[PDB]
mmCIF file of C-alpha atoms and ligand atoms in Angstrom:
data_model
loop_
_atom_site.group_PDB
_atom_site.id
_atom_site.type_symbol
_atom_site.label_atom_id
_atom_site.label_comp_id
_atom_site.label_asym_id
_atom_site.label_seq_id
_atom_site.Cartn_x
_atom_site.Cartn_y
_atom_site.Cartn_z
ATOM 1 C CA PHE B 1 -13.942 8.840 5.578
ATOM 2 C CA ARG B 2 -11.612 9.463 2.575
ATOM 3 C CA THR B 3 -12.110 8.120 -1.031
ATOM 4 C CA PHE B 4 -14.964 8.598 -3.555
ATOM 5 C CA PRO B 5 -16.541 9.699 -5.991
ATOM 6 C CA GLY B 6 -15.026 10.403 -9.398
ATOM 7 C CA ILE B 7 -11.782 9.685 -7.357
ATOM 8 C CA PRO B 8 -10.000 12.022 -4.862
ATOM 9 C CA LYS B 9 -7.230 14.440 -5.976
ATOM 10 C CA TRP B 10 -6.636 12.798 -9.402
ATOM 11 C CA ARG B 11 -9.768 12.169 -11.555
ATOM 12 C CA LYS B 12 -7.913 9.778 -13.970
ATOM 13 C CA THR B 13 -8.271 5.958 -14.199
ATOM 14 C CA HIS B 14 -4.560 5.930 -15.097
ATOM 15 C CA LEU B 15 -2.423 6.514 -11.974
ATOM 16 C CA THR B 16 1.113 5.798 -10.885
ATOM 17 C CA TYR B 17 3.415 4.864 -7.992
ATOM 18 C CA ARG B 18 7.128 4.917 -7.270
ATOM 19 C CA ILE B 19 9.452 3.276 -4.766
ATOM 20 C CA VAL B 20 11.385 6.499 -3.928
ATOM 21 C CA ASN B 21 14.056 4.414 -2.226
ATOM 22 C CA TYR B 22 13.940 0.619 -1.524
ATOM 23 C CA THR B 23 15.107 -1.057 1.726
ATOM 24 C CA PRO B 24 17.780 -3.542 0.500
ATOM 25 C CA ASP B 25 16.608 -6.527 2.609
ATOM 26 C CA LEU B 26 14.716 -8.358 -0.126
ATOM 27 C CA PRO B 27 16.071 -7.227 -3.549
ATOM 28 C CA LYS B 28 15.178 -3.594 -4.395
ATOM 29 C CA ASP B 29 13.375 -5.243 -7.304
ATOM 30 C CA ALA B 30 11.568 -7.623 -4.856
ATOM 31 C CA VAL B 31 10.450 -4.743 -2.572
ATOM 32 C CA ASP B 32 9.368 -3.027 -5.820
ATOM 33 C CA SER B 33 7.695 -6.324 -6.777
ATOM 34 C CA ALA B 34 6.047 -6.342 -3.318
ATOM 35 C CA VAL B 35 4.433 -2.881 -4.116
ATOM 36 C CA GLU B 36 3.888 -3.526 -7.971
ATOM 37 C CA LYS B 37 1.849 -6.646 -7.092
ATOM 38 C CA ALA B 38 -0.374 -4.594 -4.658
ATOM 39 C CA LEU B 39 -0.993 -2.248 -7.634
ATOM 40 C CA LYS B 40 -1.746 -5.209 -9.863
ATOM 41 C CA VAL B 41 -5.044 -6.187 -8.148
ATOM 42 C CA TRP B 42 -5.836 -2.601 -6.998
ATOM 43 C CA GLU B 43 -6.179 -2.128 -10.817
ATOM 44 C CA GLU B 44 -8.433 -5.189 -11.281
ATOM 45 C CA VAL B 45 -10.949 -3.770 -8.771
ATOM 46 C CA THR B 46 -11.031 -0.061 -9.768
ATOM 47 C CA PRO B 47 -10.912 0.733 -13.505
ATOM 48 C CA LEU B 48 -7.763 2.594 -12.547
ATOM 49 C CA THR B 49 -4.492 1.428 -13.862
ATOM 50 C CA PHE B 50 -1.496 1.822 -11.697
ATOM 51 C CA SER B 51 2.111 1.527 -12.794
ATOM 52 C CA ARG B 52 5.584 2.885 -11.839
ATOM 53 C CA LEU B 53 6.156 6.660 -12.240
ATOM 54 C CA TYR B 54 5.153 8.097 -15.595
ATOM 55 C CA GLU B 55 6.451 11.642 -14.697
ATOM 56 C CA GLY B 56 6.378 14.232 -11.879
ATOM 57 C CA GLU B 57 4.645 13.246 -8.682
ATOM 58 C CA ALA B 58 2.552 10.082 -8.148
ATOM 59 C CA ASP B 59 -0.488 8.735 -6.272
ATOM 60 C CA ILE B 60 1.588 6.855 -3.665
ATOM 61 C CA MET B 61 5.361 7.122 -3.626
ATOM 62 C CA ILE B 62 7.141 5.017 -1.138
ATOM 63 C CA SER B 63 10.363 5.476 0.674
ATOM 64 C CA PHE B 64 12.077 3.342 3.296
ATOM 65 C CA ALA B 65 12.750 3.985 6.983
ATOM 66 C CA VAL B 66 11.296 3.069 10.437
ATOM 67 C CA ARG B 67 14.114 2.739 12.927
ATOM 68 C CA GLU B 68 12.796 5.456 15.204
ATOM 69 C CA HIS B 69 12.088 8.079 12.582
ATOM 70 C CA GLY B 70 9.029 9.705 14.273
ATOM 71 C CA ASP B 71 5.993 9.491 11.934
ATOM 72 C CA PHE B 72 2.796 7.281 12.091
ATOM 73 C CA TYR B 73 3.218 3.580 13.191
ATOM 74 C CA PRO B 74 7.055 3.300 12.979
ATOM 75 C CA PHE B 75 9.945 1.342 14.299
ATOM 76 C CA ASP B 76 8.483 -1.971 15.570
ATOM 77 C CA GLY B 77 11.636 -3.493 13.808
ATOM 78 C CA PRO B 78 11.825 -6.929 11.970
ATOM 79 C CA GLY B 79 8.708 -8.725 11.977
ATOM 80 C CA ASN B 80 5.342 -7.183 12.265
ATOM 81 C CA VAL B 81 3.995 -4.521 10.054
ATOM 82 C CA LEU B 82 5.492 -1.264 9.313
ATOM 83 C CA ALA B 83 4.425 1.030 6.496
ATOM 84 C CA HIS B 84 4.416 4.243 8.561
ATOM 85 C CA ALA B 85 2.418 6.240 6.106
ATOM 86 C CA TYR B 86 0.035 9.117 5.354
ATOM 87 C CA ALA B 87 -3.245 9.272 3.357
ATOM 88 C CA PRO B 88 -3.896 10.625 -0.277
ATOM 89 C CA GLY B 89 -3.547 14.237 0.551
ATOM 90 C CA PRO B 90 -1.459 13.924 3.866
ATOM 91 C CA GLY B 91 2.335 13.420 3.713
ATOM 92 C CA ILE B 92 4.072 13.437 0.369
ATOM 93 C CA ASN B 93 0.614 12.707 -0.937
ATOM 94 C CA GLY B 94 0.103 9.007 -0.390
ATOM 95 C CA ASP B 95 3.335 8.623 1.610
ATOM 96 C CA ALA B 96 4.682 5.349 2.951
ATOM 97 C CA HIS B 97 8.002 4.362 4.613
ATOM 98 C CA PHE B 98 8.578 0.617 4.987
ATOM 99 C CA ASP B 99 10.342 -0.742 8.068
ATOM 100 C CA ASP B 100 13.829 -0.329 6.632
ATOM 101 C CA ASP B 101 14.578 -1.915 9.961
ATOM 102 C CA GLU B 102 13.074 -5.230 8.701
ATOM 103 C CA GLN B 103 14.592 -8.212 6.979
ATOM 104 C CA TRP B 104 11.905 -8.227 4.292
ATOM 105 C CA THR B 105 10.505 -11.706 3.743
ATOM 106 C CA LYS B 106 7.537 -14.107 3.794
ATOM 107 C CA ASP B 107 7.991 -16.782 6.415
ATOM 108 C CA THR B 108 4.199 -16.828 5.893
ATOM 109 C CA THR B 109 4.796 -13.560 7.751
ATOM 110 C CA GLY B 110 7.957 -11.930 9.204
ATOM 111 C CA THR B 111 7.306 -8.942 7.105
ATOM 112 C CA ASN B 112 6.627 -8.571 3.367
ATOM 113 C CA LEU B 113 7.113 -5.082 1.865
ATOM 114 C CA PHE B 114 4.159 -6.325 -0.316
ATOM 115 C CA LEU B 115 1.168 -6.075 2.021
ATOM 116 C CA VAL B 116 2.087 -2.923 3.827
ATOM 117 C CA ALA B 117 2.484 -1.642 0.296
ATOM 118 C CA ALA B 118 -1.262 -2.465 -0.144
ATOM 119 C CA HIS B 119 -2.057 -0.969 3.270
ATOM 120 C CA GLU B 120 -0.211 2.124 1.802
ATOM 121 C CA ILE B 121 -1.518 2.141 -1.842
ATOM 122 C CA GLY B 122 -4.954 1.680 -0.238
ATOM 123 C CA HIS B 123 -4.289 3.987 2.717
ATOM 124 C CA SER B 124 -3.561 6.831 0.324
ATOM 125 C CA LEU B 125 -6.699 6.646 -1.792
ATOM 126 C CA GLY B 126 -9.188 6.196 1.061
ATOM 127 C CA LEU B 127 -10.481 2.599 1.572
ATOM 128 C CA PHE B 128 -8.342 3.158 4.718
ATOM 129 C CA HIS B 129 -9.275 1.062 7.841
ATOM 130 C CA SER B 130 -12.071 -1.532 8.391
ATOM 131 C CA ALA B 131 -12.484 -4.980 10.034
ATOM 132 C CA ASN B 132 -13.205 -7.850 7.580
ATOM 133 C CA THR B 133 -11.533 -11.174 6.580
ATOM 134 C CA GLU B 134 -10.667 -10.824 2.837
ATOM 135 C CA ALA B 135 -9.830 -7.128 3.260
ATOM 136 C CA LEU B 136 -6.593 -5.324 3.013
ATOM 137 C CA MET B 137 -8.143 -3.775 6.118
ATOM 138 C CA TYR B 138 -7.673 -7.293 7.681
ATOM 139 C CA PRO B 139 -5.073 -7.278 10.558
ATOM 140 C CA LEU B 140 -1.766 -8.564 9.176
ATOM 141 C CA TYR B 141 0.917 -10.139 6.897
ATOM 142 C CA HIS B 142 -0.794 -13.560 6.657
ATOM 143 C CA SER B 143 -2.614 -12.188 3.614
ATOM 144 C CA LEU B 144 -5.399 -14.758 3.156
ATOM 145 C CA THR B 145 -6.745 -13.382 -0.119
ATOM 146 C CA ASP B 146 -3.158 -13.107 -1.628
ATOM 147 C CA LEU B 147 -2.312 -10.570 -4.407
ATOM 148 C CA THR B 148 -3.317 -12.463 -7.573
ATOM 149 C CA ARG B 149 -7.077 -11.785 -7.211
ATOM 150 C CA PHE B 150 -6.755 -9.915 -3.907
ATOM 151 C CA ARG B 151 -10.550 -9.034 -3.620
ATOM 152 C CA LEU B 152 -9.826 -6.268 -1.113
ATOM 153 C CA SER B 153 -11.894 -4.863 1.812
ATOM 154 C CA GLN B 154 -15.584 -4.115 2.406
ATOM 155 C CA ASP B 155 -14.385 -0.461 2.417
ATOM 156 C CA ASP B 156 -12.517 -1.430 -0.755
ATOM 157 C CA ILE B 157 -16.041 -1.904 -2.102
ATOM 158 C CA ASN B 158 -17.141 1.501 -0.725
ATOM 159 C CA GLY B 159 -13.894 3.151 -1.853
ATOM 160 C CA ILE B 160 -12.393 1.440 -4.953
ATOM 161 C CA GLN B 161 -15.899 1.411 -6.485
ATOM 162 C CA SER B 162 -15.396 5.207 -6.458
ATOM 163 C CA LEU B 163 -11.874 5.298 -7.725
ATOM 164 C CA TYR B 164 -13.243 3.697 -10.833
ATOM 165 C CA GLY B 165 -15.579 6.757 -11.145
ATOM 166 C CA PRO B 166 -14.481 7.704 -14.729
HETATM 167 C C1 LIG O 201 -2.357 -6.127 6.936
HETATM 168 C C2 LIG O 201 -1.469 -5.092 7.620
HETATM 169 C C3 LIG O 201 -0.220 -4.798 6.786
HETATM 170 C C4 LIG O 201 -2.253 -3.796 7.893
HETATM 171 C C5 LIG O 201 -2.955 -3.897 9.260
HETATM 172 C C6 LIG O 201 -4.359 -3.263 9.375
HETATM 173 C C7 LIG O 201 -4.429 -1.738 9.486
HETATM 174 O O1 LIG O 201 -4.992 -1.082 8.608
HETATM 175 N N1 LIG O 201 -3.906 -1.180 10.585
HETATM 176 O O2 LIG O 201 -4.003 0.047 10.737
HETATM 177 C C8 LIG O 201 -1.980 -3.459 10.352
HETATM 178 O O3 LIG O 201 -1.415 -2.370 10.271
HETATM 179 N N2 LIG O 201 -1.749 -4.319 11.348
HETATM 180 C C9 LIG O 201 -0.765 -4.076 12.390
HETATM 181 C C10 LIG O 201 -1.257 -3.026 13.367
HETATM 182 C C11 LIG O 201 -0.139 -1.997 13.690
HETATM 183 C C12 LIG O 201 1.167 -2.644 14.190
HETATM 184 C C13 LIG O 201 0.215 -1.079 12.499
HETATM 185 C C14 LIG O 201 -0.453 -5.407 13.070
HETATM 186 O O4 LIG O 201 -1.370 -6.041 13.593
HETATM 187 N N3 LIG O 201 0.816 -5.851 13.051
HETATM 188 C C15 LIG O 201 1.132 -7.165 13.579
HETATM 189 C C16 LIG O 201 2.406 -7.725 12.931
HETATM 190 C C17 LIG O 201 2.560 -9.247 12.981
HETATM 191 C C18 LIG O 201 3.377 -9.906 12.043
HETATM 192 C C19 LIG O 201 3.854 -11.191 12.314
HETATM 193 C C20 LIG O 201 3.192 -11.979 13.268
HETATM 194 C C21 LIG O 201 2.135 -11.414 14.001
HETATM 195 C C22 LIG O 201 1.898 -10.033 13.944
HETATM 196 C C23 LIG O 201 1.243 -7.043 15.105
HETATM 197 N N4 LIG O 201 2.269 -6.345 15.599
HETATM 198 O O5 LIG O 201 0.393 -7.557 15.830
HETATM 199 CA CA1 LIG O 202 7.719 -4.457 12.126
HETATM 200 ZN ZN1 LIG O 203 9.322 7.427 7.928
HETATM 201 ZN ZN1 LIG O 204 -4.331 1.104 8.733
#
C-alpha cells in the first residue's frame, strides 16, 4: 500500500495540517481541536511533529462538506462517519471534507470531527485501512484507544514506523 520509508512526499519529521474551513456544529476551535488531538498522538508514534500550517501547503488540509458533494464516502448525514477524503498524493494532497451535514459531537458517538480527522491524517500518509481493535483502522467513532495515547493501527506500526524514517 501507501506509506514508508523515509516518509512519502515530504521527508521531514516536522509536518503540518490546516482546517481549511471548519463546519460550525461544534465550535470551529473544537473541530480544530478534534483534528489537532489526532495530530497529537500521530506525533507520539512517528518522530514527526505535526502542527497547524507553518506556510504554503500542508500534509493534510481539511475542509468541510458532505451533503451530496460527490467525492469518496460522502453525505451519510448526522451520525456515522464522514471524512470523505483522499490519500497523501490524491486530492489536495491529504484531502478531507468532514460531514458538514453533521451536528458534530460525542454522544460516545454521533459523530466527532476528531476521529475522522485521524482516519484522514492517517489516510493521507498511508497507514490507510486495516482490521484491528486499537487501530485507527478500527471501524468507528467509539474510539476505544482514545487520543491521549492513541496507540494506532497494526498498519500504523507498518506505516508510522516509516514516517519516523529521519
Ligand atoms: C473509525 C472511523 C472514523 C473510520 C472507519 C474505518 C475505515 O478506515 N473505513 O474506511 C470508517 O470509515 N467506518 C465507517 C465506514 C464507512 C461509513 C466510511 C463506519 O463504519 N461508519 C459507521 C458510523 C456509525 C456511527 C455511529 C453509530 C454506529 C455507526 C457506520 N455507518 O456503520
Ligand atoms: Ca455521517
Ligand atoms: Zn467533499
Ligand atoms: Zn478508510
